[PDB]
Amino acid sequence: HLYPGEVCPGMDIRNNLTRLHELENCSVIEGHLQILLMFKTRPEDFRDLSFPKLIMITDYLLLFRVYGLESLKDLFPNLTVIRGSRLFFNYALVIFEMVHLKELGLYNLMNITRGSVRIEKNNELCYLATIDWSRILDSVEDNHIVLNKDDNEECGDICPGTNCPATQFVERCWTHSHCQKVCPTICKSHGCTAEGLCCHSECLGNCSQPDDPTKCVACRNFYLDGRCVETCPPPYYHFQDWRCVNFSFCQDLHHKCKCHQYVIHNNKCIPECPSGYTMNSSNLLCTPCLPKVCHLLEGEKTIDSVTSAQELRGCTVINGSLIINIRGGNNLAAELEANLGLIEEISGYLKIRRSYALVSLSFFRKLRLIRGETLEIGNYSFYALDNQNLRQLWDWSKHNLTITQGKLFFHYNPKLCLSEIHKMEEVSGTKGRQERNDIALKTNGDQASCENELLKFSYIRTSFDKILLRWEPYWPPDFRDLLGFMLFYKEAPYQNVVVDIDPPLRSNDPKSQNHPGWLMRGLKPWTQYAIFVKTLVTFSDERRTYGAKSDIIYVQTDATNPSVPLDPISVSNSSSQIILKWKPPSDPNGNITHYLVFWERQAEEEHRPFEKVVNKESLVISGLRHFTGYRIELQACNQDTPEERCSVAAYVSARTMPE
Amino acid sequence: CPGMDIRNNLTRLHELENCSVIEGHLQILLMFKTRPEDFRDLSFPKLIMITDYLLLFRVYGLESLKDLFPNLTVIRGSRLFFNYALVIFEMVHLKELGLYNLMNITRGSVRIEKNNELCYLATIDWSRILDSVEDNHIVLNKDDNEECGDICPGTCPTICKSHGCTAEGLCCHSECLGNCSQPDDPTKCVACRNFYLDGRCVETCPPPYYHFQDWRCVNFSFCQDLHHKCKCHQYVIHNNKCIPECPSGYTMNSSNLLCTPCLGKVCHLLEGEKTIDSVTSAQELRGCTVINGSLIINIRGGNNLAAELEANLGLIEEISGYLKIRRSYALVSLSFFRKLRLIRGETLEIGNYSFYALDNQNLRQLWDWSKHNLTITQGKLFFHYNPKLCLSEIHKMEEVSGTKGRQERNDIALKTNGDQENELLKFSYIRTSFDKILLRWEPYWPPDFRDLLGFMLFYKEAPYQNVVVDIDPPLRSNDPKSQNHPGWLMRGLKPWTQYAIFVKTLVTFSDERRTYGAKSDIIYVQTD
């Protein structure tokens, strides 16, 4: 009993039902069952499709956009136990986006060993709360019953009831003839026999004889050698939370993919290693990393969006190739780097084609091996076409790279100098590989500025809010070509990193200060700034006069008076003690040297009893009259010795306790 | 009086002794040493009318012009430098106008630049004098670098349309223009509308006077002089008009130089090249046929001269060499060639072309090819950066000229030409809501449906009907009975909300004439 016919694995079927007839003599699914993507199937396609022989699906049952399917009692009129060995989003019944699915027909769904139930976007689905999941599941707290027809209450869900044990004051039923196997309170979850005695402490759902670990129908946690056991000891290993396996189970399944070659950690037979590990393949005890090799399916993958990019998050090595047509997306090169900038190695080729809106590929700093095992056709390990806005491969003085095979398809990418190619020819080390118009020279680097020189500051003056600058007047041969000066400030105290200024009067040069000028006005004090200017010159129809550009400078703001000492709270916890507490100023503007506390009695230049609070955010004020009105003044300071730079007052008051 | 040209000294300036009317231009410049005292002792206020234009350039000392010619009244605008009857340029000391008596620029505009001392602008209107007010470019002045309290010096009715008014405001004679010394009097006009003859304003020449240079009336003897003094333009007589040349298809008479029709006009180019840029270039070869050489064009304007282009334009249909156009931004059509059927391309546009096209952005029409044919003897076609001319007309022009087998890969820029179509898919099913729109719409299928890439639904809100989503292609494989009407659900809609919505189709270009595809109609859908 419990194993009549065939023991089959899982099945995934799409767009036709010539293949679902294979579950006729299949009594067991050792896996899951997903019927998906059938917009052409009809209710006639599932009425003459009935499988009472198929009993247990170990992982889950999934349905996904099958038009026409209406009920599972038409398909599988005896679906009872889903052990949940594998779970989709921690669900053992995933009913997702089912059009035409009118009911479950799960009048005999009795047990789930592990998991929950996913019922989403099923616009026709009823019989969901009536087939009560609390009697099936250990944990209904994790269920997903949303966006259904049972949710928006229009289902005419009728029970068969228009000696079952009872817990309103109401019992629960499954069919007209199927009472639930209901066990008493002392039989917690192990199930019980026909007369009602509690089984061993390792059973689940049902057992055949009570108080015996060899007689369960399902096990609670574990099982070994004709007996639901408490744990899996060595030289055996844990496996899949319903049994124990030995070493030769784990060793040989590691060797049959010669794919999740089985490994061992914490006396288990796990498919792959846990975190930070690179196995010893011999003993397979989850060895520590000495790394994420992402073999792509059929050696390739096309990435064109951030959603297509999040799929390979955290990869390092690619045992395959990539295709790239990324033309847009929000938070590009940041979502793209956290997913894919981590990638170090590529076995196959690389393809980029028509990837429009991207400007710099510097964020793939890891990508330093290309094996070129799969080759882009034309004897290339590389493809770049129509990649329009691209202006940086890398700082090749920064980024080194190994490309093992193949040539380089450089075509129609009009915004890159040949020097970056000649960088990449040099630094990746493939300069002698590429044939005739692998590099289409005239289709690249013809629609971007090439300001070959540097803008340099003849004068710099700073303040806390103001930075006055004078720098080099660049002049093209015909000076009419100069159209502007393009100061691109951005705030950066880090040095690991937008204003346009018109051309000045050319007009002369015996002694002509046409050094152009900029003063800033709204700047944060004590604050450093990635600022970089560029000459705006005219692209001639001929060789454009290139221009200059300033370097990314980093100029910190001056240190001025600090901000308000935040939240002055004066608490009179005694007749003589007052605890004054506060927060640091939001603008230190210079390193906060100390704080200043004054205090002053309210009646009922001169010295007040004072306190310089050095690098502390609290103060107890002692030596005070009982129950007397005080006025307390608080200041902060970011300069201490020379003629101090200090904050404004933060007034507060407190009256001590009486006697 | 003819057009005069004075530089480097004030010597030739007192030759203006008695000129009441200029029939010509004026170009006086390069006078830095001249002083404001050098112009106070200087005036020739006899002058009333100029035909062509004026040049003004870097004459120092010069401050105002009401002293010199307070009585200058009309620029006819008969020759326009870059469509300007005036450019005032780099004029130091030049402070004000006082020139109320100028009345009509009949033709042209004024470009004002670098006249760093200029005031007195705002209280005077342009539509009064200039027929076209838009083409003025007024920049780089004292009033521009804002310092001038522009008043009139003093601080005609609309029925006096072109004839203008006298001193009391009465409309002048039909052949007056602008002003009359006595109201409605051709004799006592200040200026003539059409012709001047014998102290009077007439419209035509009474015989034997020829309609000579469109403002006067000279007898046979006078034009007969103009021929023989060149023994320079020896003039000819045709259609009661003494003129310099006979137009195309014409043959002179030995007796009276009548431009008789030929029994079957060679505008032989200087250097075999006219590089073409301007109105000033446009007046030159009006009405030609034979272009004995090649032509280069750069006109990046925007004030589209397209009509007055076509006035002094192509009655040509022949080019002995190639053709060149680069960066001619402004124009949209090329239909304005009245005869054009042949280019030889024997001189090759380099790249062995008959032709050069670059950065010609607004161009949408070559021709109605059914009407206007095309023949190219030698050469290929340089077609580049012309984002409003489709490859269809290109492949037509390949075919109408018949030179489709001559051109090579990216002689025609395959991308930047026409990137800024025949079918229109229709919404075969429409569902709406207060918050949703579900649609099914007609299936487009190219023959090679490997090339099919997507459906591009442009949508935006538009309560006005004064008017961005890709949607996937469905599965072809066959379509006898398939709802390959693809579906997409609008989801984020507000109740009672109006959109402009239209689909467009996305395919892959095969190197043939492009299998086009569809848009959809700009539909307007309101929610609830």
């Binding site: 009419r480 159209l483 | 870059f82 450019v87 470009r111 840029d277 301007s278 990046r300 925007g302 931004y329």
Partner: peptide, 30 residues
């Protein structure tokens, strides 16, 4: 908004050249 400023600034610059071109030419006849 870019290329509208690209044209005229060069086109006004273009304007100024041919009027310079009819300056230098009559200096030699020789």
């Amino acid at each position: 908004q870019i290329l509208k400023e690209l044209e005229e600034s060069s086109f006004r610059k273009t304007f100024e050249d041919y009027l310079h071109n009819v300056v230098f030419v009559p200096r030699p006849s020789r």
